[PDB]
Each structure stands twice: as structure tokens, then as C-alpha cells.
Design a protein around this ligand. Sequence first.
Ligand SMILES: Nc1ncnc2c1ncn2[C@@H]1O[C@H](COP(=O)(O)OC(=O)c2ccc(Cl)cc2)[C@@H](O)[C@H]1O
Length: 501
Amino acid sequence: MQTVNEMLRRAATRAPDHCALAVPARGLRLTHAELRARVEAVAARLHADGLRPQQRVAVVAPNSADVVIAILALHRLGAVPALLNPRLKSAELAELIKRGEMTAAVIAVGRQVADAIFQSGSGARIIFLGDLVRDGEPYSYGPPIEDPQREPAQPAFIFYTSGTTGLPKAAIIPQRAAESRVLFMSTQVGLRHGRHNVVLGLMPLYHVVGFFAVLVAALALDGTYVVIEEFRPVDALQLVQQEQVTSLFATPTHLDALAAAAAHAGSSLKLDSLRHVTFAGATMPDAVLETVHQHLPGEKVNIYGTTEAMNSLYMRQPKTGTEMAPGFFSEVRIVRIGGGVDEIVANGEEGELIVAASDSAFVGYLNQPEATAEKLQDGWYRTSDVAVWTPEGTVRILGRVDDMIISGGENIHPSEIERVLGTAPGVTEVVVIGLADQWGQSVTACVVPRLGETLSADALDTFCRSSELADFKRPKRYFILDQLPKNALNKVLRRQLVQQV
Ligand SMILES: Nc1ncnc2c1ncn2[C@@H]1O[C@H](COP(=O)(O)OC(=O)c2ccc(Cl)cc2)[C@@H](O)[C@H]1O
């Protein structure tokens, strides 16, 4: 295997004086050799203060060069970094760190978090990021330390992933997973080894794409990672131009923003250097996709992936955001909902997408053996997504099993109806739910008007009748709301909505 550490180490022997980290706004640049020096120095410092291999360290910070240095230093030492979304409420962060039995916590968020950690009773030692490394410059004492022995199945990193109503679960990523979590960027997306690589770090580092597929890949291929501390669509495009960015990996929401800024900019922004525009994470509307093809350069690639197994499907120059096919490393099937991994459907029938659990796969959720046994079954990872094989030999993603509505013997996927209701005049936001009906469930739309506008059930039903929706799919009730209840990561508390209505 090559661990994260070993991929970056080899890269540094190959391209020591090439730029590894660029932070344009701050005028900071570090070569592969310089980044290595600082990784080693922060590692030694942590080891002198008593941090040891296989111990877990929570990391809670926005993207920055300093956090890259810190995360890589923890790994270099042998400790297991547990990367956490900084938008999580203090209390949820304090509880996850606690449940994880973590030796320490590296944070670059408020005093309020720091309190909440201390005030929770977990033994985790609080480390402020700017106390470890500041603007690429470490506070250094001790140097240097032993490169610890790493084993294929051994835990390497922990990433968090939301469940059928949280808290987020701690997915344990083993040492052997790193290589294939990088190399799909080459086999599926077509990135290749070389100092030509300038990768815009738009994805957050607490997400497996932000870290393996963007940061680690950028470096492991002897390229440059461009740090983005806060997403700004025009600024980001200026960086593409200034830095000669070759690839960018973003969410449907980033790309919608970028496509529009690019449309407005025209030939004012030179985007020639950009060869790869990759997206994953959500199912992108057709309208967003179309503007992507229209106003952004480079090859477009849709990537289906999970925290648990990384990349399982993809599509080059996609026409819809729903249809993708397995690539290298991957093996997939669609099986009856709630059935065995060998219960294959008559393709064209709907079932659960499951993918083989091989080298890229997590080894389990930390301290949740029951959730693990639901997800990892007989060599397979179960995605909890509903899918169908198209007559074209592709996998159409339909929606979450958990979101699926069962109304009079039929699967009804809210995402499909939300897609249609989204295009109705005056609708700013819509979530579609099943309300308990003693037939099984009744399809219900919850709709928010655009600022100052009015909506009506009559008008929205008419609109649905004029749509391509199958009759049985049209909502039976509408609720016009001024807000949908959401968590701190702004996703709909669908169960709590059901309650609210
Ligand atoms: N291109 C895509 N289209 C539709 N759904 C997609 C998608 N990529 C991921 N998803 C779904 O979003 C969920 C978001 O889960 P998360 O745990 O937030 O992580 C990801 O998005 C993700 C995407 C790609 C890779 Cl290689 C690794 C991780 C995921 O579990 C899938 O069920």
C-alpha cells in the first residue's frame, strides 16, 4: 500500500522545490520540501507534548494551510485525525469528541466550542490551531521523531457522515483505502501525475472528497493545492485564471454560482487552463447542469460517492445528474429493498444500490456496531440509495431509501416531485413528505414562497397537472410555509417537518 503519508513523502522526493501549497490572498507559498519540513516539525512538537500513534485527535477548522499542515502532522505522527464540520453546533461537536474517546482536539473555531468541550466531561486536550502552526510557520521544539509502522487494516482517519436522523456517525477509514481514494481521480476523472497539476481546494477538508480526492491527490500527483478560505464565485474564477488551475471539484451549488458568474464575466475571465470540472455529493438539477456545460470550460464529470466507500459510479459529459456507471475499483448491484445482497432485481425494477466493500471501504463506524452491521453485509456496503438500471446500461439514482414514500403500493421519490415543484412560479423552496395515512402514506408538499409572493394549493396542483408527473405522484395536500426546519448543516429535519404539519 501507499498510505497518505507515503504518497506525500514520495512526491516530496520527486518534486522537492515545486509549489505544494499556495495561499494567494495571504501571499503564502510552500514547496513540497518546505511543507514536509513543517509537517515533521509540527509532528515532533505534538510528540514532545505526549501524543502517540493510534490515539484519536479531533480537528475542527475552516480550510487553511495551517490545518493542512496540522492534519498531515497528526497522520505523520501516527495519530488518527477525526475531521469535523465547523458548522456543527458546539454541543454536537463536544458530544462527538466525547463518544469518540479522543486524546485531544485541534480547533480554529470560537471560545464557545472550547468551553463546551471542557464543560462536557470528555478527557480531550484542547489545542488551538494557531498555537501549533500560524501562517505556515510552526512553533517548533524537540525534532525529529520515528516514522511509525502502519498496517493496511489499521485506522488512518475518521470522517463523519449523517444517519437516519443523526448524530453523524464516525466512519473509520483504514490505511489501505487512501490509494484508491486518490487514484479514482486519475482512472475516472483523468487527472495524471505531474507538476502541471493546479487543484483549486474548493471542497472542505472535513469531507472525504475535500481531503483524499482534492488535497491528497493534488500533492500525491506532485502538483499544487490552492487553498480557498471562503467561497466567492468571481474570486474563485480569478484564481482559476491567476493560478492557472487545471482542475476543480465542487458541489452543484458552487457550480451553479460559478457558471452564472462566468456567464456574466464572458471573455473578461480567461478559464483556458481549466481541464477538469468535477462534481459529486448531491444530485444536480438539469438546469444547473446545462449552464455548467454552457458557461464553464473543461471536461465535466459526475461522481457518485460515499464517505464509506468513496467512488462507485461516474459519468463523463453528463446529460442528467442522475445517471452514472461503475468505474475502476468498483463493483455494484441493485438489490430488493431490505433483502439480501444476492437478491438482484429484474433491471428496470427499483431496489437498493450496494457496492462491494474492498480496499477503499471504511472498516466500521466507531462505537456503533449495530449501524455497522446494517451497512456492511457479506462483503458489500449498502448505500441506502434507491436506484434503477436504465435500458442504456446505466444506474439511475432515484433518492434515499429513507426519503421514499410508499403510497398505495408505490414507491414515490420526493426528489422527483421537488424537482418539478421547484420550477413553479413563486416557489423558493420545497420539500415533499409522506404523511401517515391509515393508504400507508399520502404525498404532501411543503412549499416556501419567494420573498413577498403568495402561493396557493389550487395553483400548485394545476401546475403539477400540467407537468410530466404521473397522476399517482401529484401531492394530495400542500402546506405553504415561511421556513423549513433545518439543522446547523442546513438540511431539512424531515421527521420534525412531519410533526410540525
Ligand atoms: N453525484 C451524485 N449524485 C447524486 N447523489 C450523490 C452523488 N454523490 C454522492 N451522492 C449521495 O450523496 C450522499 C452524500 O454523502 P456524504 O457522506 O455527505 O459524502 C458525499 O457526497 C461523497 C460524494 C462522492 C465521494 Cl467519491 C465520496 C463522498 C452520498 O451518501 C450519496 O448517497
